[PDB]
């Protein structure tokens, strides 16, 4: 609604860019596969929320 | 044109189609890290 | 005699040449030699 969009979409890109580098590094790392796992449930589970809001909130700025 | 709410992302969508090519280039950086075993 | 890995310089020098030749292909559309 008005600007609550270019913030959510720019937060979507910022989360997308940190995982794409963050997920695969966590991926081949035996540093902490349980410590380094729940941040992947959080991010990906949050990533779906950010695309779901930017999608249905889109229609109020189109 | 695009939207207008998505108009600020024009320089971002101008570079996205090239990303597939970079995965092929990544296979050589990553194998040069293991020394072509 | 190897304090910096060879694969790092291989990518840096590789990324370095990608840009300079791309500057040449870019110049084919602007300035002289662009038919415009």
């Amino acid at each position: 609604m008005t600007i609550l969009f270019q913030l959510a979409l720019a937060a979507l890109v910022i989360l997308s860019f940190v995982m794409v580098i963050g997920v695969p590094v966590a991926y081949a790392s035996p540093q902490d596969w349980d410590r380094s796992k729940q941040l992947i449930f959080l991010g990906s589970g949050l990533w779906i929320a950010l695309v779901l809001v930017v999608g249905v909130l889109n229609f109020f700025v189109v | 044109k695009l939207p207008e709410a998505y108009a600020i992302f024009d320089p971002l969508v101008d570079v996205l189609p090239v990303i597939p090519v970079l995965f092929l280039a990544l296979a050589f950086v990553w194998q040069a890290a293991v020394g072509f075993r | 005699g190897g304090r910096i890995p060879l694969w790092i310089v291989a990518t840096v020098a590789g990324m370095g040449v990608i840009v300079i030749v791309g500057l040449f292909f870019y110049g084919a559309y602007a300035g002289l030699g662009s038919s415009l």
Binding site: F17, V20, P24, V25 | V15, L26, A33 | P5
Partner: peptide, 30 residues
């Protein structure tokens, strides 16, 4: 403008080798 295209293709382009370098220093399954 131009910088906006070049500023981000550099970030997209650096993200690749960053993944191979980060686990090289932490001895990941490369």
């Amino acid at each position: 403008e131009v910088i906006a295209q070049l500023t981000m293709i550099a970030m997209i382009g650096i993200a690749g080798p960053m993944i191979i370098f980060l686990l090289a220093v932490r001895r990941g399954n490369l």
